[PDB]
C-alpha cells in the first residue's frame, strides 16, 4: 500500500515534507517520495505522505501540496490504469495530476492526459 510515482522526466514525485508545493524532482525514491495509498471509498484514493499529511489537488488553483491534515474534498483521486501499465490521477475537479516535466511544481489543472500526466509506479517494498 506504499508506492512511489516516477514522472515523465524519470524523476520521482516528492512531498517536499509539506514545505511548499510538491515537485517531481527526486533522482531516487526515498522517504519523501513514498506515499501510502488510502482507499477513500467510491472508487477513490487518497495519498498520505512522509509527514502524515495528505496530498491535495488544491482544486487546480495553485500547485499541489502535501500538507492537509485530513482528507476532504480535494484530497481524493481517481486512479486511472493506462494501457502501458502507467497510472494517471484525476482530481475531484476532473483534471489530471501533471509532473510538469519537473520545470515547475506539480499541478492538477490539465483536462486531458499527456506524457507529463502519466506516472510509472511500484509498491515501495
Residue numbers in the entry: 888 to 1012
The authors write:
Carbohydrate-binding modules (CBMs) are non-catalytic proteins found appended to carbohydrate-active enzymes. Soil and marine bacteria secrete such enzymes to scavenge nutrition, and they often use CBMs to improve reaction rates and retention of released sugars. All proteins analysed bind preferentially to β−1,6-glucans.
To probe the mode of binding of CBM92 domains, we successfully determined the protein structures of the C. pinensis proteins CpCBM92A and CpCBM92B by macromolecular crystallography. These structural data reveal three distinct carbohydrate-binding sites on the protein surface, with one site found within each of three structural subdomains (α, β, γ). The binding cleft Arg residue in the β-subdomain of CpCBM92B is found in subdomains β and γ in both CpCBM92A and -B, but is substituted with a Ser in the binding clefts of subdomain α in both proteins. This substitution in the α site leads to a substantial increase in accessibility around the glucosyl unit’s O2, which may permit binding to oligo- or polysaccharide extensions from this position. For CpCBM92F and AaCBM92B, which both lack one functional site, binding is compromised compared to wild type CpCBM92A and CpCBM92B, which both have three binding site Trp residues.
